[PDB]
Amino acid sequence: XXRXX
Amino acid sequence: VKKPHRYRPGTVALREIRRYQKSTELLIRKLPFQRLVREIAQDFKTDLRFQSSAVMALQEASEAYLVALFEDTNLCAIHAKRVTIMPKDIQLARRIRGERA
Amino acid sequence: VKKPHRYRPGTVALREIRRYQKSTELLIRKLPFQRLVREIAQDFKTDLRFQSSAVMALQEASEAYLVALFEDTNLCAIHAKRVTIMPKDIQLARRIRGERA
Amino acid sequence: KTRKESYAIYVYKVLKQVHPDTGISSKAMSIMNSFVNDVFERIAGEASRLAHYNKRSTITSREIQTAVRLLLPGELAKHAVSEGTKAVTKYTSAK
Amino acid sequence: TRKESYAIYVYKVLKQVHPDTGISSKAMSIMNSFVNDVFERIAGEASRLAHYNKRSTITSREIQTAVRLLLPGELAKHAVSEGTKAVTKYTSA
Amino acid sequence: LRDNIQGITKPAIRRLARRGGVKRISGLIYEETRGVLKVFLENVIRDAVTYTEHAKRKTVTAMDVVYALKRQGRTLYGFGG
Amino acid sequence: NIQGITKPAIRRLARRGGVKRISGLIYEETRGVLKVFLENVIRDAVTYTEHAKRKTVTAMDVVYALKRQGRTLYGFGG
Amino acid sequence: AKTRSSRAGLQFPVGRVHRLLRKGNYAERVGAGAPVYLAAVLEYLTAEILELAGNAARDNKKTRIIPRHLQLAVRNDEELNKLLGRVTIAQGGVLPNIQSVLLPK
Amino acid sequence: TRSSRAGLQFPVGRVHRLLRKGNYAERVGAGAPVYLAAVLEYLTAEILELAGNAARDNKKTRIIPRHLQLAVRNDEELNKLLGRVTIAQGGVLPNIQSVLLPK
Numbered sequence: 001x002x003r004x005x
Numbered sequence: 006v007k008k009p010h011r012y013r014p015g016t017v018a019l020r021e022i023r024r025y026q027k028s029t030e031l032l033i034r035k036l037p038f039q040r041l042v043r044e045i046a047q048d049f050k051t052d053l054r055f056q057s058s059a060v061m062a063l064q065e066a067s068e069a070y071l072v073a074l075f076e077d078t079n080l081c082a083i084h085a086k087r088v089t090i091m092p093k094d095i096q097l098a099r100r101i102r103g104e105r106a
Numbered sequence: 107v108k109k110p111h112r113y114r115p116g117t118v119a120l121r122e123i124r125r126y127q128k129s130t131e132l133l134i135r136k137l138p139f140q141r142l143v144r145e146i147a148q149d150f151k152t153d154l155r156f157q158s159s160a161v162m163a164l165q166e167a168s169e170a171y172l173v174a175l176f177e178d179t180n181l182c183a184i185h186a187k188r189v190t191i192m193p194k195d196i197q198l199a200r201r202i203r204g205e206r207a
Numbered sequence: 208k209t210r211k212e213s214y215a216i217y218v219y220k221v222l223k224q225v226h227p228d229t230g231i232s233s234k235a236m237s238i239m240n241s242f243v244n245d246v247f248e249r250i251a252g253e254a255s256r257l258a259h260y261n262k263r264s265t266i267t268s269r270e271i272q273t274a275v276r277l278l279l280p281g282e283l284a285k286h287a288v289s290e291g292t293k294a295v296t297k298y299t300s301a302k
Numbered sequence: 303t304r305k306e307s308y309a310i311y312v313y314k315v316l317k318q319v320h321p322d323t324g325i326s327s328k329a330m331s332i333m334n335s336f337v338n339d340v341f342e343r344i345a346g347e348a349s350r351l352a353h354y355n356k357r358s359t360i361t362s363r364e365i366q367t368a369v370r371l372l373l374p375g376e377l378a379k380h381a382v383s384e385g386t387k388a389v390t391k392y393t394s395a
Numbered sequence: 396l397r398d399n400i401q402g403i404t405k406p407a408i409r410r411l412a413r414r415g416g417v418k419r420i421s422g423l424i425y426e427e428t429r430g431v432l433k434v435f436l437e438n439v440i441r442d443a444v445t446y447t448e449h450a451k452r453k454t455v456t457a458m459d460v461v462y463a464l465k466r467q468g469r470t471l472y473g474f475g476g
Numbered sequence: 477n478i479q480g481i482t483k484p485a486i487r488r489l490a491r492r493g494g495v496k497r498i499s500g501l502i503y504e505e506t507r508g509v510l511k512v513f514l515e516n517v518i519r520d521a522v523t524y525t526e527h528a529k530r531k532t533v534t535a536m537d538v539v540y541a542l543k544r545q546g547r548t549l550y551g552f553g554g
Numbered sequence: 555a556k557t558r559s560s561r562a563g564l565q566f567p568v569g570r571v572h573r574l575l576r577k578g579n580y581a582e583r584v585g586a587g588a589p590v591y592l593a594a595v596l597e598y599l600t601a602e603i604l605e606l607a608g609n610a611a612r613d614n615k616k617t618r619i620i621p622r623h624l625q626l627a628v629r630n631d632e633e634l635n636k637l638l639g640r641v642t643i644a645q646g647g648v649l650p651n652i653q654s655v656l657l658p659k
Numbered sequence: 660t661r662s663s664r665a666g667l668q669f670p671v672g673r674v675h676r677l678l679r680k681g682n683y684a685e686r687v688g689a690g691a692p693v694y695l696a697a698v699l700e701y702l703t704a705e706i707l708e709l710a711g712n713a714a715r716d717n718k719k720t721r722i723i724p725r726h727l728q729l730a731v732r733n734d735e736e737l738n739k740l741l742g743r744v745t746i747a748q749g750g751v752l753p754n755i756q757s758v759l760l761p762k
Contacts, residue, residue, distance in 0.1 A: 003282055003705070015658070018418045022652055025414040029622050029647035032410035037402025044396035045436050046455070049444040058457035062474040062644075063439065066464050068411065069471075069642040070435055071428065075415025076648075077202045082417075083655055084198050085186045089419040090412070092427040097185045099431070101178045101202040103742065106735070116761065119496045123755055126492040130725050130750040133488035138480025145477045146514050147533065150522040159535035163552045163747070164517060167542050169489065170745040171513055172506065176493030177751075184758055190497040191490065193505040200509070204639065207632070212673070214703075220668040221704045222722075226711035230721040234551060235710070238724055238746055241554030242706065243699055245744070247677065250695060253466075255579060255683035260462060261450055266683055268690035273449040275698050277442055277466065280736045283705070287698045294697030295690045298665035306570070308600075314565040315600050316619075320608035324618040328473055329607070332621055332643055335472040336603065337596055339641070341574065344592060349580040349682060354540060355528055360580055362587035367527040369595050371520060371544060374633040377602070381595045388594030389587045392562040395555070414648055418656040464642075473621060473644030492751060496759040551724060551747030579682050 031064055038064050074098060132165055139165050175199060214243045250274045268295050308337045344368045362389050400429050439463050478507050517541050559593065566593040566600075606631055621645035662696065669696040669703075709734055724748040 025032065039060045046053050075090070077098035082090040099105040126133065140161045147154050176191070178199035183191045200206040218239045222231055231239070253274035254266050263270075268291070275287050312333045316325055325333070347368035348360045357364075362385070369381050408428045412420050440455075442463035447455045461476040486506045490498050520541030525533045535552045542549045555561055558568035572589035606627030607619045614623070625646030628634045661671035675692035709730030710722045717726065728749030731737045 003286055005286070015418060015656075018413070019652065019656070019658075021410075021413045022416055022418065022656075023650065025410055026416070026648055026650040026652075029625075029645045032414060033403060033407045037399065037404070040396060040399040041402055042436065042440065044399045045433070046440045046444060047396060049441055050448060052453065053444065053447070054454035056454060056456050058474055059443070059455045059460050062457045062460040062464075062471060063436065063443075065473070065644045066439065066460070066469060066471050066642060067432060067435060069646075070469065071408075071411045071432060072415045072648060074431065075412045075417050079412075079415060079417045079653065080198060080201060081182075081185060083653055084182065084194070088656060089421050090417050090424055091421040092423045093185065095424070095427050095431065097181060098202055100181060101199055103203075106738075114761075116496060119491070120755070120759070120761065122488075122491045123494055123496065123759075124753065126488055127494070127751055127753045127755075130748045133492060134481060134485045138477075138482070142477050142480055143514060143518065146511070147518045147522055150519055151526065153531065154522070154525075155532040157532060157534050159552055160521070160533045160538050163535045163538040163542075163549060164514065164521075166551070166747045167517065167538070167547055167549050167745060168510060168513060171547065172486075172489045172510060173493045173751060175509065176490045176495050180490075180493060180495045180756065184756055189759065190499050191495050191502055192499040193501050196502065196505050196509065207635075214669070217669045217700070218703055218707070221700055222707045222711070224668065225704050225708045228720065229711045229714060231707075232721050232723045234724050234748060235722045235727055237553065238550045238727055239703060239706070241550040241552075242741070242744075243703060244554055245548060245550070246699060246702055247674070247695070250698065251678060251681055251683045254691070256462075257446075257449055258684045259579070260446070260458075264685040265688050266678060266686070266691050267688035268694040269449070270688075271691050271694040271698070273445060277445055278740075279702075280739050283702075283736045283740065286705075287701050290701040291694040291697045294665045294667055294693050298661070298671075298690065298693045301664045308566075311566045311597075312600055312604070315597060316604045316608070318565065319601050319604050322617070323608045323611060325604075326618050326620045328621050328645060329619045329624055331475070332472040332624055333600065333603070335474075335476055336638075336641075337600060338476060339470060339472075340596060340599055341571070341592065344595065345575060345578055345580050348588070350540075351524075351527060352581045353682070354524070354536070358581060359583040359585055360575060360588045361585035362591040363527070364585075365588050365591040365595070367523060369591075370523055372637075373599075374636045377599070377633045377637065380602075381598050384598040385591040385594040388562045388564055389590050392558070392568075392587065392590045395561040416652055416656070418652075468640055469642060470640060471642045471644065494755055494759070546743050548744045549747065550744060579684060581682060 031068055033064060033068060035060075035064070038067070077102065132169055134165060134169060136161075136165070139168075178203065214240045218243065249278055253277055308334045312337065340372075343372050347371055400433055403429055403432060438467065442466055478511055481507050481510060516545065517547075520544055558590070562590045562594065564590070564593050564597055566597040568593045571596070603627060603634065606634070622647055625649075661693065665693045665697065667693070667696050667700050669700040671696045674699070706730060706737065709737070725750055 042060055042063050043055065074095065078090045078094045081094040081097045096105065143161055143164050144156065175196065179191045179195045182195040182198050183189065197206065215236050218236060219231065222229065250271060254270040257270045257273055258266055272288055272291060275291065276284050279287055309330055313325065316323060344365060348364040351364045351367055352360055366382055366385060369385065370378050373381055405425050408425050409420060443455050443459045446459040446462050457474045458476060461471055461474050464471045483503050486503050487498060517538065521533055521537040524537040524540050539549055539552050539554050548554065559566065562568055568589045571593045572584065575584045575589060603624065607623045610623040610626040611619045621643055622645065625643045628638050629649045662669060665671060671692045674696045675687060678687045678692060706727065710726045713726040713729040714720065714722050724746055725748065728746045731741050731746065732752050
């Protein structure tokens, strides 16, 4: 899903 | 007491296949496709202008891609011992092509 | 009286699928593939030498390509309501990929 | 003995950044180096094509940014652009 | 302003192949695009070949190898023959 | 602009299928084809608008579309390039 | 020599591909397909080695040949 | 003869090809024979496509080559169709073919 | 150095040299190498984060090509990026079609 950094 | 001249199902389909493989004019209507192109582009940048040539290029590319996809789809439908193309056929064509994951 | 433990057909096939999707070693024996590569090359140029890494790279690329082809072939066979892959499945996969004309 | 260059040390530094207690094998390091070279070539070639299309003789950070936005998918492109802009600003801050 | 193209050269080739045959503007544009595309392909492959061999110059040998890689069998053979003959004629003159 | 994907009517998809050599078309094919077309146009116009923005233009030129298609591996002849 | 690609080896490749049941004729078809693929890749590799005026085909030649066909390979000094 | 094409006996521009090779960022230096070779190859391919396109135009009793004829020429030729396998020709259309199973019996 | 001046681990100097010698354009801007090095470092960091995750799931402290393949193919975006790439000694993701499973 959406990445952290 | 007369009956009209109804062609057997599949005859006019073949006539249309011949007619549309013989010709080259674009099959999608121009204004609806232009409106679709602008609507899709509205999600990437607002107040965009399109050269008429740009919309025509997009239409040619899209129609060619769809025709090739339908050729592959027909090949898969025939592979399944069918004559009718079904959404599963399009999905298999795209999956093998590498487009769909 | 006595009876062997023969697994129902299709079970060892699943066990092998699991075993070979879990591993990474090359599935073609090195030496026969190396001989095949040398024979194919000798058509294009005579008295050719091959770096060991060159043959290894050829084997890796070939095995990866064949595995992807068999994945598409299996998808094609399943599309035909079958479970066995048959040469027409490979032919359809290659035709849709764009490899075979 | 020829002096061959690679990204091994920088890949290792990034790895120790993200996974301090984790090593990497020679084969995996070679794969990572190949990946870095491939991405470098893709982005640089797309930037060169962008500069040529615009009749521009210089590859600037803007060309790299647009090449990245073209090549990488959505979230990857977003985060790569963020990191690139961060690095460029931090660079221009110092001299 | 000046928009360069391959229109005149493709027309010369056409009249040398089919002297009584014309070409439409759209077909002209398609042929020009095709020439540009093949130019880009061959030139890019030659550039890659020069880079791979740590070579700074694109010679006729690089173009020949790029043609051999890019084109299929018979097309590659005939293109190589034409290129070598043209280079030989150029060197003689 | 709202609900313009339905502007790709059923007969238009029928014509495209016929040019593809299709004799019989399932009823569900039209919506699937519309979805596929939307995905393709999204992928192309994204790159076209990226090229337009890089050139600092408000107008998407045919050459931007041609570059986008060439990038995706669908080189198009007849519109420059 | 092409028969050196044995039936069990193609079985293993099919299994790694997720194939449960394999027809009898799949083996000859697979041998033909592999032969075509190797022909293309080795032709490009040998072209690269000839252009470099070398009698040895290096892994880099194979990697470049694969990259040409859109089959980039990692792990051999790409 | 002044023009480099005349020296090479070509219809394509050797000078223009050389200039493009130089202003294309392909390499630091460009050999003297590379433009001649590339111009010859481009001329050969153009003639090869135009021969078949003109044949197709003649088959249609048409004096002028239109994109349809170029498409027919490219797609009916195995090698050329392989060269332009991933190319779309605007207004090209498709090769007329219908799968056998779809025909009546 | 210039990497430290930009807070990067990857070499801005080497990237600048490769951009200049790669025949990409006549001149290379000052921020282009920094931007490109930042992007490359970010992508390697992402790949390595996922690969180390996979190695931990396998109870291994060293990343091997199998872990790189797992990280790339499991992740949608990386797999799309490396779509036409084959990773040596990577294998494939365990995947068996539903119809093939026993009933």
